[PDB]
Design a protein around this ligand. Structure first.
Ligand SMILES: CC(C)(COP(=O)(O)OP(=O)(O)OC[C@H]1O[C@@H](n2cnc3c(N)ncnc32)[C@H](O)[C@@H]1OP(=O)(O)O)[C@@H](O)C(=O)NCCC(=O)NCCS
Ligand SMILES: Nc1ncnc2c1ncn2[C@@H]1O[C@H](COP(=O)(O)O)[C@@H](O)[C@H]1O
Ligand SMILES: [Cl-]
Length: 661
């Protein structure tokens, strides 16, 4: 069609796959019909195994059909490996002088080029601190509450080295949100830093961790804390240790060697707390062999990473993108990457382009919310940067519309880049539907074709049968892939209910359209999870937080279209009778949400429902009406006949118009 953008000739010549779509389709066909042999060949070619699996013809066992028994997936059972060894040791000594991370702080005077050789030293030191000073054993859980600094990667890899299970808590979560994750994961140890900075905003980390640890102790836990020096904290005697002091306890040889814990294929690698449609965030569990292979193989092909490329992903390790596509995937393929602690607008909106030109970045993986913010700020901030080295631009985490896609390619990338809009989720471990540079014609707004080994389908929402050819409906995956999450920590029943409700399929929770070229167009979540600036958050978590303010009776949270964030957070709420409502009181309710969850959950609009929320006669809030009001779609309010209090509708519209929103 006329909306197709051809891959660049240069990227076709460079591609690991080939210069034409036929090259990709040749491998894809093999990856489906010889699925086991394909993954066995990739696994053997691209990774170190202490022990290999016994049969190339049979590297997966699984059940996707609840009627036949428990849902499960296993990949490479019988194999033995280690993620840290594949990310680091095996690249030495050959690549000891290769830069692993070009680190830059929020402050542009803070920089460091960290080689693979230096990463090895840093990781063996920390691994020995964990083993010998903290007694961290295989399978123990370790919480990370860290900024995007080299130590964050060191910490993830040291835990992998000794077979500990990490759970990374995004540094923007509050103390209450951190404490909840440490309690649910039963962490023995929290690794944090003194502090960070984001633009002009100080980011307390250890001071926040102090309140989280106090809450955990009141609950009967005992959690030690190791604190990296990044930027004078109150350190609790016996509980808290500065990393410099822990390092001083090491013997000389503990700076040089640390034994690798050789892991079985299905040993747990990390727990990542993720918001769902109902209830509190649940920990998605990823194991070792399948996830290692999948994250790294998607990194290689979706970005066409070669050794002469320099890579920059703008995502935080607190989310799956930073796990798969900042630390694990890139280092396993010996990438040279940019590691950036700061924000795109500090000191000003040229900052990311200054990084691109300084480090000769050729592959940039970022998010549509960031792109849309750069678009609003003006093209002069981009055009002062030399972007000649860019050849691949990637987008993750939300739909991108045609205007932002075109701006990314033709302004940001000067019209000499391919764009990889990658669709995937925390639960899928790595990319699932994505272009590949040089071989895949792009349609702006489409994720295009499935990754090797991936079989998506479109299910009819009513019959729940597959639809063939051009079709719209529920996006599902009909067969296993190595990167799939294996369970929800402590709740396999919820895992089966949420993702395997239709026998034979992994259900994504997204809607999608497949077109006549087999390209997929993801249309968004079909449940009650919001996508706020790329971050998924459940409406009921925000509602509960709002309801903890003592003046609040009732609240309902819905998403609404937002020209930068994609989806904003809209709060309808009612206060107790006789409350005097001021900008300050609404500010206090907002601050309560930021105390309970964190700034990522800040309401964008708070509308006071003078007469109450629209409810049925059984007392259930009719959220459909609230979604339509918050979006300004007054003609599509829908049925009011089931409301017990139909008189509230007029006020809700009039207020919304007043706020505008
Ligand atoms: O740009 P940005 O404002 O940094 O990005 P977002 O708008 O997604 O961030 C929203 C909030 O989360 C905070 N945040 C985002 N990423 C963060 C991180 N890695 N660590 C700590 N806080 C973070 C921001 O500082 C901001 O706080 P504010 O509301 O007090 O200004
Ligand atoms: N490329 C994309 N296009 C559209 N939506 C996306 C894309 N990538 C991720 N998403 C959305 O983000 C969700 C995954 O969020 P997360 O688990 O944080 O990665 C998906 O279920 C989609 O709703
Ligand atoms: Cl859920």
């Amino acid at each position: 069609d006329s909306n197709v953008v051809e891959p660049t000739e240069a990227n076709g010549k460079k591609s690991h796959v080939g210069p034409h779509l036929g090259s990709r389709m040749r491998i894809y066909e093999y990856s489906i019909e010889h699925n086991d042999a394909f993954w066995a060949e990739i696994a053997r070619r691209d990774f170190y195994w202490k022990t290999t699996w016994p049969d190339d013809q049979h590297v997966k066992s699984y059940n996707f059909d609840k009627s036949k028994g428990p849902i499960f997936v296993k990949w490479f059972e019988g194999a033995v490996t280690n993620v840290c060894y594949n990310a680091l040791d095996r690249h030495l000594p050959a690549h000891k002088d290769r830069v692993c991370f070009y680190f830059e702080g929020n402050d542009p005077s803070v920089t460091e080029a960290v080689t693979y050789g230096s990463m090895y030293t840093r990781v063996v030191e920390l691994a020995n601190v964990l083993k010998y000073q903290y007694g961290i054993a295989k399978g123990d859980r370790v919480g990370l509450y860290l900024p995007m600094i080299p130590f964050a990667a060191v910490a993830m890899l040291a835990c992998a080295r000794i077979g500990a299970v990490i759970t990374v808590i995004f540094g923007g979560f509050s103390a209450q949100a951190l404490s909840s994750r440490l309690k649910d994961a039963q962490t023995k140890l929290l690794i944090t830093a003194d502090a960070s900075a984001r633009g002009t905003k100080p980011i307390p980390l250890k001071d926040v961790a102090d309140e989280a640890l106090k809450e955990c102790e009141e609950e009967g836990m005992s959690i030690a804390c190791l604190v990296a020096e990044n930027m004078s904290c109150k350190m609790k005697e016996g509980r808290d240790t500065w990393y410099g002091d822990a390092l001083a306890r090491l013997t000389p040889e503990q700076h040089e060697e640390c034994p690798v814990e050789w892991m079985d294929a299905e040993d747990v690698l990390f727990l990542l707390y993720t918001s769902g449609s109902t209830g509190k965030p649940k920990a998605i569990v990823h194991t070792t062999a399948g996830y290692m292979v999948y994250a790294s193989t998607t990194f290689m092909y979706s970005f066409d990473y070669h050794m002469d490329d320099v890579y920059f992903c703008t995502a935080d390790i607190g989310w799956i993108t930073g796990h798969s596509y900042v630390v694990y995937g890139p280092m396993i393929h010996c990438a040279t990457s940019v590691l950036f602690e700061g924000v795109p607008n500090y000191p000003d909106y040229s900052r990311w382009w200054q990084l691109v030109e300084k480090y000769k970045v050729s592959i940039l993986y970022t998010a549509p919310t960031a792109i849309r913010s750069l678009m609003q700020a003006g093209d002069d901030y981009v055009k002062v940067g030399n972007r000649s080295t860019l050849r691949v631009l990637g987008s993750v985490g939300e739909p991108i519309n045609v205007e932002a896609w075109k701006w990314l390619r033709d302004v940001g990338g000067e019209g000499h880049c391919d764009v990889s809009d990658t669709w995937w989720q925390t639960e899928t471990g790595g990319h699932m539907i994505t272009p590949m540079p040089g071989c895949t014609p792009m349609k702006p707004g489409s994720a295009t074709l499935p990754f090797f080994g991936v079989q998506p389908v479109i299910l009819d929402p009513m019959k729940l049968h597959e639809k063939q050819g051009p079709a719209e409906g529920l996006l599902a995956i009909r067969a296993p892939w190595p990167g799939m999450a294996r369970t929800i920590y402590g709740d396999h029943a919820r895992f089966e209910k949420t993702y395997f409700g239709v026998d034979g399929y992994y259900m994504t929770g997204d809607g999608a359209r497949r077109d006549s070229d087999g390209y997929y167009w993801i249309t968004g979540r079909v449940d009650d999870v919001l996508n706020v600036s790329g971050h998924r958050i459940g409406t009921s978590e925000i509602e509960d937080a709002v309801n903890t303010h003592p003046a609040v009776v009732e609240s309902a949270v819905v998403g609404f279209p937002h020209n930068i964030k994609g989806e904003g957070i809209y709060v309808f709420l009612t206060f107790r009778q006789g409350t005097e409502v001021t900008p300050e009181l609404l500010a206090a309710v907002k601050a309560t949400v930021r105390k309970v969850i964190g700034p990522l959950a800040t309401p964008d609009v708070m509308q006071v429902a003078r007469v109450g929320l629209p409810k049925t006669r059984s007392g259930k809030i009719v959220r459909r009406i609230l979604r339509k009001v918050s979006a300004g779609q007054y003609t599509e309010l829908g049925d009011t006949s089931t409301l017990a209090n139909p008189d509230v509708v007029e006020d809700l519209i009039a207020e919304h118009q007043r706020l505008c929103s």
